[PDB]
Amino acid sequence: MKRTFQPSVLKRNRSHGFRARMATKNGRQVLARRRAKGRARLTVSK
Amino acid sequence: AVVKCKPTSPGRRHVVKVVNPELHKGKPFAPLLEKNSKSGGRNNNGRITTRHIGGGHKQAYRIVDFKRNKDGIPAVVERLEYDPNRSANIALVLYKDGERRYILAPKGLKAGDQIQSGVDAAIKPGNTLPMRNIPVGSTVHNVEMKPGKGGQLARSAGTYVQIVARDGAYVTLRLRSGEMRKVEADCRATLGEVGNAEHMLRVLGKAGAARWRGVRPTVRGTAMNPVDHPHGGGEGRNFGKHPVTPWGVQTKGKKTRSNKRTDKFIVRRRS
RNA sequence: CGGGUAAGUUCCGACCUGCACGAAUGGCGUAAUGAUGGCCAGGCUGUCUCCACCCGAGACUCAGUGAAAUUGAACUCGCUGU
RNA sequence: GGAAGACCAAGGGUUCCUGUCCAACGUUAAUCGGGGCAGGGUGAGUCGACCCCUAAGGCGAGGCCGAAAGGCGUAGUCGAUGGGAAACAGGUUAAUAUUCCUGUACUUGGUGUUACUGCGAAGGGGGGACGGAGAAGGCUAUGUUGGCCGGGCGACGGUUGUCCCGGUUUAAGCGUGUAGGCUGGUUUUCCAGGCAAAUCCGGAAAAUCAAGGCUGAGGCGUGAUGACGAGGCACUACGGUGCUGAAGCAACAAAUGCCCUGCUUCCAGGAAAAGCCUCUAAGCAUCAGGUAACAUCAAAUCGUACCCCAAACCGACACAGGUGGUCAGGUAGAGAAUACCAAGGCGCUUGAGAGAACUCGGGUGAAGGAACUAGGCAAAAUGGUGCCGUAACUUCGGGAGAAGGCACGCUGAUAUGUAGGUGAGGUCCCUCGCGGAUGGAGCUGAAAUCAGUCGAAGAUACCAGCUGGCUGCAACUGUUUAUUAAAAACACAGCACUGUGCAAACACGAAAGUGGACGUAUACGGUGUGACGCCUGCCCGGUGCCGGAAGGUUAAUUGAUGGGGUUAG
RNA sequence: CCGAACCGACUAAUGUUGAAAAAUUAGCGGAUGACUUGUGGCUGGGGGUGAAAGGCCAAUCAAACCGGGAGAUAGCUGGUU
RNA sequence: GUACACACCGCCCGUCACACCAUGGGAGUGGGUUGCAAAAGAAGUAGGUAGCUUAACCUUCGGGAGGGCGCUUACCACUUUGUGAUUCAUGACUGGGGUGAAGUCGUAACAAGGUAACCGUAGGGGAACCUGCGGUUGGAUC
RNA sequence: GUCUCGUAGAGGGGGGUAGAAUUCCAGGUGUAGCGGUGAAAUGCGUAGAGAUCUGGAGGAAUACCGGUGGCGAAGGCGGCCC
Ligand SMILES: [K+]
Ligand SMILES: [K+]
Ligand SMILES: [K+]
Ligand SMILES: [K+]
Ligand SMILES: [K+]
Ligand SMILES: [K+]
Ligand SMILES: [K+]
Ligand SMILES: [K+]
Ligand SMILES: [K+]
Ligand SMILES: [K+]
Ligand SMILES: [K+]
Ligand SMILES: [K+]
Ligand SMILES: [K+]
Ligand SMILES: [K+]
Ligand SMILES: [K+]
Ligand SMILES: [K+]
Ligand SMILES: [K+]
Ligand SMILES: [K+]
Ligand SMILES: [K+]
Ligand SMILES: [K+]
Ligand SMILES: [K+]
Ligand SMILES: [K+]
Ligand SMILES: [K+]
Ligand SMILES: [K+]
Ligand SMILES: [K+]
Ligand SMILES: [K+]
Ligand SMILES: [K+]
Ligand SMILES: [K+]
Ligand SMILES: [K+]
Ligand SMILES: [K+]
Ligand SMILES: [K+]
Ligand SMILES: [K+]
Ligand SMILES: [K+]
Ligand SMILES: [K+]
Ligand SMILES: [K+]
Ligand SMILES: [K+]
Ligand SMILES: [Mg+2]
Ligand SMILES: [Mg+2]
Ligand SMILES: [Mg+2]
Ligand SMILES: [Mg+2]
Ligand SMILES: [Mg+2]
Ligand SMILES: [Mg+2]
Ligand SMILES: [Mg+2]
Ligand SMILES: [Mg+2]
Ligand SMILES: [Mg+2]
Ligand SMILES: [Mg+2]
Ligand SMILES: [Mg+2]
Ligand SMILES: [Mg+2]
Ligand SMILES: [Mg+2]
Ligand SMILES: [Mg+2]
Ligand SMILES: [Mg+2]
Ligand SMILES: [Mg+2]
Ligand SMILES: [Mg+2]
Ligand SMILES: [Mg+2]
Ligand SMILES: [Mg+2]
Ligand SMILES: [Mg+2]
Ligand SMILES: [Mg+2]
Ligand SMILES: [Mg+2]
Ligand SMILES: [Mg+2]
Ligand SMILES: [Mg+2]
Ligand SMILES: [Mg+2]
Ligand SMILES: [Mg+2]
Ligand SMILES: [Mg+2]
Ligand SMILES: [Mg+2]
Ligand SMILES: [Mg+2]
Ligand SMILES: [Mg+2]
Ligand SMILES: [Mg+2]
Ligand SMILES: [Mg+2]
Ligand SMILES: [Mg+2]
Ligand SMILES: [Mg+2]
Ligand SMILES: [Mg+2]
Ligand SMILES: [Mg+2]
Ligand SMILES: [Mg+2]
Ligand SMILES: [Mg+2]
Ligand SMILES: [Mg+2]
Ligand SMILES: [Mg+2]
Ligand SMILES: [Mg+2]
Ligand SMILES: [Mg+2]
Ligand SMILES: [Mg+2]
Ligand SMILES: [Mg+2]
Ligand SMILES: [Mg+2]
Ligand SMILES: [Mg+2]
Ligand SMILES: [Mg+2]
Ligand SMILES: [Mg+2]
Ligand SMILES: [Mg+2]
Ligand SMILES: [Mg+2]
Ligand SMILES: [Mg+2]
Ligand SMILES: [Mg+2]
Ligand SMILES: [Mg+2]
Ligand SMILES: [Mg+2]
Ligand SMILES: [Mg+2]
Ligand SMILES: [Mg+2]
Ligand SMILES: [Mg+2]
Ligand SMILES: [Mg+2]
Ligand SMILES: [Mg+2]
Ligand SMILES: [Mg+2]
Ligand SMILES: [Mg+2]
Ligand SMILES: [Mg+2]
Ligand SMILES: [Mg+2]
Ligand SMILES: [Mg+2]
Ligand SMILES: [Mg+2]
Ligand SMILES: [Mg+2]
Ligand SMILES: [Mg+2]
Ligand SMILES: [Mg+2]
Ligand SMILES: [Mg+2]
Ligand SMILES: [Mg+2]
Ligand SMILES: [Mg+2]
Ligand SMILES: [Mg+2]
Ligand SMILES: [Mg+2]
Ligand SMILES: [Mg+2]
Ligand SMILES: [Mg+2]
Ligand SMILES: [Mg+2]
Ligand SMILES: [Mg+2]
Ligand SMILES: [Mg+2]
Ligand SMILES: [Mg+2]
Ligand SMILES: [Mg+2]
């Protein structure tokens, strides 16, 4: 059966990548939060 | 001509075609074509704002001359053509100086006919004049509402407008709706009726024929749940309320015109 | 009431006493169509009378690997009563 | 074996190859592994990306709009799933190869010579450039048979022949220009069009010639005195290397591939932009620039291993699931169904016995034949082609494959292989060719009829409609509760009412705007009904909607009049 | 219209600590169209989308998920060495 | 003018109720005849002929020819199956018709029959009928 | 039966146009009735009808001529102009 995760790198980067996050103020608050938590990987960006 | 299909399959039994042997069979005139992609009835918020629109055949846009302001130069009809964008047919015309344009095809117009626009044009079908120069009582189409703006009234297949009176700077028109409407006498109009009057005699015959035209199905409000539509609900077929739109406004007689700016031009409403 | 069956609360045709049909929240018909509902017949048969035998895969034994739900504690019988 | 073979994209990321190890991982053992450890392995002007160009859509200087955050959008700038230059065959590694090597090619650009010469764009025109279905003809891939070449003479009767086995392969490029497709050509004069100009496109009028151009599969030639090649021979570290090498033709059949972005036809009427060709403007003037030949230089960078219907991707698993594109042999067959095979790939990571009940998946069954049961659930049955034949009803299409029935293998003859298809030499003609005409050798080859013959059975396996009668509902094909409901529900063409005069009604939106629509009442929205046929009666008291506007009542607003507080007196 | 690929999901058996959190096997429907499919885009939670089943919106839907108000409140149940 | 003549206190129409009779439709069903498509194949006759058996003819004395039986093929009666056509009988119920009798409801026609009658058509109504549209005089009065 | 010349005609088909009248719409004047019948009532009217004047819209039919007149196979055909 077809499952929910059907990977595509272009769609991954367009939807959640670093530059998509930087494009809006709400996305920059995601990055601010993850930096404050100290995540080793800020985004999906490979 | 109006042609019934033979009932060789259930989807063909009720089909009625309008077949016109005079329409061009080849490709349209390319310099007057533009692309025109579809909307699905969605605006720039991406929301459906007009229901029941989607799909259907790809269509190119034909640039049609509704202004008819190339005055004093005669043109000859080269051919009639099918236009997917409208109910009327269109005519490709060649002006004496070598320019080609598309116009709405009036009833009776055929290849070889001559047309002209301007104050001094002859009173003949396909000619365009300011209504100041058109006899009262005439039948016209593609009528301007503001001088120089371009035709806006009576453009659909088989429609026309009657010039019933002329008083000062204004003429009074009887529109197809039955409305009596004042328009400036300097507004242009084309003599005759829009052609292709048999358009309304066609019968689609099957559901798919509406889908070919970009029309998606209509779901009755009484077939829904209450959360979806004021008519929804009921154990069985129930109704019991005054018919309304999906947004709650009465839909069987309640009037919705509210334009005090243009009220001064309506001599008499359609009813 | 009639038909079909040896026998028919279903089915078909009628009657009208419509608890409580009825004319576009349509009425009455309707060829064709339907993995649609009901009923009848021919063919067909292990569906059944009424099961028998056979071929394979498990079940069973040996070697290797090795779960689960559950679980107050158990030295965890019948009966009649309480 | 239309895959369980081969090869890509996506996704993964070393899983690839070699050596070594067997703790853990592997549903068992493991000497083995997609496991551990170590080393190795991915070579490009031509393949792909990057790049030029745009679609939907995104962002968006100014701008318009919005308490703020922000929303929309112009000029622009991004964005492939689409348009845009060029390489093939052979050989080679343990592991890469259109990338390395051998042979033979091609493309774009920079320079520099030479010869000749109106070049010039952010502008104009052309082109690129486009649907569905259907029908053929011409072909090739490919196959089959013959010929040819090499080998064979058979474990058991026969096998020197009308016998057996194998091979019979060769590209891009360059040259040629055929089946076919499209279009009349050429030269002058003139002109309200193409924002200016134009020799270009469009238009008008003459003259003259009638064949001129554009496009185009395949074939043929060359590429190739080469490469490959059955086998043979010699070595092996027995895995394999080294050496040599015959024939290398024809006929017939033939695609879903090519000609074909064609042709015919239909209505639902079928992207864009650049590359490319052409025209001139400002400008430049024996300069630059353009065209051609020749030479020379450059073509960077990143990807390239491996899996890819899967043990490497998505499913927590070495999971009976899911996953877009390409390739398409033989015999039978209508076929990409199905059966058996080829190339190629596999036996599914617990086995060994036994031969109880019972469960699962199957086979057969005396007599009966729906008596079973809620119900013929399940099973059994029917099943092909040709011909004969086929009722009520019907919207005249249907119903219909109604129903029912007959024939069917093999051998011989007709006919040493027929009708038909294909077509060589020859001969004739020619405006001499990839030509026409004639002619038919060779090859291929149904179907039928007559006679005979074997079996219980000839559509023998696999494959492959059960049929008929009465009736409810829905006209019909479609759609739906992903995961207990597929229906009589939803939709539907058709019908009606009603709104809507365009800055339309209506909808999204504090708004700007956007959809409706580059539509205009034969149009668009809402609502109900639901093909078609015959039809659709009475009620306006209630609720709503529409119209009316004389009167009664009534909001903010206005503040007449009366009453009170204070106190100069 | 008949029928493979492809798209579905009418019946039965199995399976129900499955091989599988919806499948397998035998049959079944559509199969040039209101068809099917790849890649990319757009619509956002009282909101979307819906040939309408309250269906679907990441194994979640009569109001998604994540974080916060937050130790909501619990005249109720349990427990209290 | 008249459809009156025991003479308008005349004549007379239709539904409804009652009785009887024939007939159309009808879920269908049961018989007779018959078409079409097949299956079937007794006896007979004809063709063929493995096998068996032979009075007349011919033999070179073994046989030969010819015949018969058997077998087989063709044609075909009985019979069987499927599906139509036609005809007769019958059927709950239902449609109108005739006759009788006169009960109930009216009074359509005959006089200008009290709205002149009638024809075609359409709609309506318990019934005769009424109404619209065109037509006729086979209308009285004037 | 054909040809030549002329005559009368609501013979047919198509198009245009004119005047009278009805209805409706707008406005002016004006005020209590109008309309209808055997008699009435329903209906219309002080929200201004009916009556009268002006302007407009629209459809249908063609007074007088007109005649036991004409034309046409019958059914039928009537303003004027082409
Ligand atoms: K996404
Ligand atoms: K059109
Ligand atoms: K609907
Ligand atoms: K409802
Ligand atoms: K309901
Ligand atoms: K319901
Ligand atoms: K309704
Ligand atoms: K109906
Ligand atoms: K069904
Ligand atoms: K049925
Ligand atoms: K395992
Ligand atoms: K073991
Ligand atoms: K042998
Ligand atoms: K590689
Ligand atoms: K097979
Ligand atoms: K045992
Ligand atoms: K031949
Ligand atoms: K079949
Ligand atoms: K119906
Ligand atoms: K279904
Ligand atoms: K539904
Ligand atoms: K019908
Ligand atoms: K019909
Ligand atoms: K009412
Ligand atoms: K009312
Ligand atoms: K598509
Ligand atoms: K919803
Ligand atoms: K989620
Ligand atoms: K919510
Ligand atoms: K009777
Ligand atoms: K009968
Ligand atoms: K009468
Ligand atoms: K009379
Ligand atoms: K009458
Ligand atoms: K009555
Ligand atoms: K005449
Ligand atoms: Mg709609
Ligand atoms: Mg359109
Ligand atoms: Mg509709
Ligand atoms: Mg519902
Ligand atoms: Mg509500
Ligand atoms: Mg109900
Ligand atoms: Mg009710
Ligand atoms: Mg009974
Ligand atoms: Mg009974
Ligand atoms: Mg019944
Ligand atoms: Mg009802
Ligand atoms: Mg009711
Ligand atoms: Mg009604
Ligand atoms: Mg009703
Ligand atoms: Mg109703
Ligand atoms: Mg209905
Ligand atoms: Mg269906
Ligand atoms: Mg054990
Ligand atoms: Mg590793
Ligand atoms: Mg390996
Ligand atoms: Mg290793
Ligand atoms: Mg182990
Ligand atoms: Mg060990
Ligand atoms: Mg290893
Ligand atoms: Mg390893
Ligand atoms: Mg923007
Ligand atoms: Mg800005
Ligand atoms: Mg853009
Ligand atoms: Mg770009
Ligand atoms: Mg691309
Ligand atoms: Mg490799
Ligand atoms: Mg070939
Ligand atoms: Mg070849
Ligand atoms: Mg031997
Ligand atoms: Mg060659
Ligand atoms: Mg070549
Ligand atoms: Mg195909
Ligand atoms: Mg590789
Ligand atoms: Mg395994
Ligand atoms: Mg798997
Ligand atoms: Mg698939
Ligand atoms: Mg094959
Ligand atoms: Mg197969
Ligand atoms: Mg045992
Ligand atoms: Mg057993
Ligand atoms: Mg069993
Ligand atoms: Mg069996
Ligand atoms: Mg038995
Ligand atoms: Mg037996
Ligand atoms: Mg038996
Ligand atoms: Mg039986
Ligand atoms: Mg029973
Ligand atoms: Mg029983
Ligand atoms: Mg069954
Ligand atoms: Mg079976
Ligand atoms: Mg068949
Ligand atoms: Mg051939
Ligand atoms: Mg019933
Ligand atoms: Mg249906
Ligand atoms: Mg379900
Ligand atoms: Mg289901
Ligand atoms: Mg707008
Ligand atoms: Mg309905
Ligand atoms: Mg589905
Ligand atoms: Mg299946
Ligand atoms: Mg079907
Ligand atoms: Mg099918
Ligand atoms: Mg929220
Ligand atoms: Mg519900
Ligand atoms: Mg879900
Ligand atoms: Mg809530
Ligand atoms: Mg709080
Ligand atoms: Mg709490
Ligand atoms: Mg009878
Ligand atoms: Mg016999
Ligand atoms: Mg009377
Ligand atoms: Mg009378
Ligand atoms: Mg009659
Ligand atoms: Mg009446
Ligand atoms: Mg009357």
Residue numbers in the entry:
A (entry chain 1): 1 to 46
B (entry chain c): 2 to 272
Published text:
To demonstrate the capabilities of our cutting-edge instrumentation and experienced team to support external user projects requiring cryo-EM single particle analysis workflows, we vitrified, imaged, and analysed purified E. coli ribosomes stalled during translation. The ribosome has been a suitable target for single particle cryo-EM due to its large size, globular shape, and high RNA content, which generates relatively high contrast in the otherwise noisy cryo-EM images. In summary, we present multiple structures of the E. coli translating ribosome, with the most populated state resolved at a global resolution of 1.55 Å. The structure, combined with previous insights, resolves many important features of the ribosome at atomic detail including chemical modifications, magnesium and potassium ions, as well as water molecules.
Further 3D classification resolved a class containing ~650,000 particles of a translating ribosome containing P-site tRNA and a weaker density for the E-site tRNA with the small 30 S subunit in the unrotated state. This is a widely observed state for translating ribosomes isolated using in vitro translation systems. A 3D variability analysis focused on the tRNA sites identified two subclasses with P- and E-site (~500,000 particles) and A-, P- and E-site (~150,000 particles) tRNA densities, respectively. In this map, the P-site tRNA is tethered to a nascent chain (NC) density with weak density traceable to the backbone of the alpha carbons. However, clear densities of side chains were not observed in the polypeptide exit tunnel due to averaging of several states during translation and thus we did not fit an atomic model in this area. At the current resolution, we can observe separate EM-densities of water molecules coordinating magnesium ions bound to the RNA backbone. In addition, we modelled EM-densities for potassium ions, based on their identified positions in a recent X-ray structure. Although the state of the ribosome is paused at different states during translation, we visualised the mRNA with defined anticodon-codon interactions being visible. The highly resolved rRNA in the presented structure allowed for sequence identification of portions of the rRNA directly from the map, where we detected a C-G base pair swap in H79 of the large subunit rRNA. This swap is due to sequence variation in the E. coli B-strain, compared to the MRE600 strain.
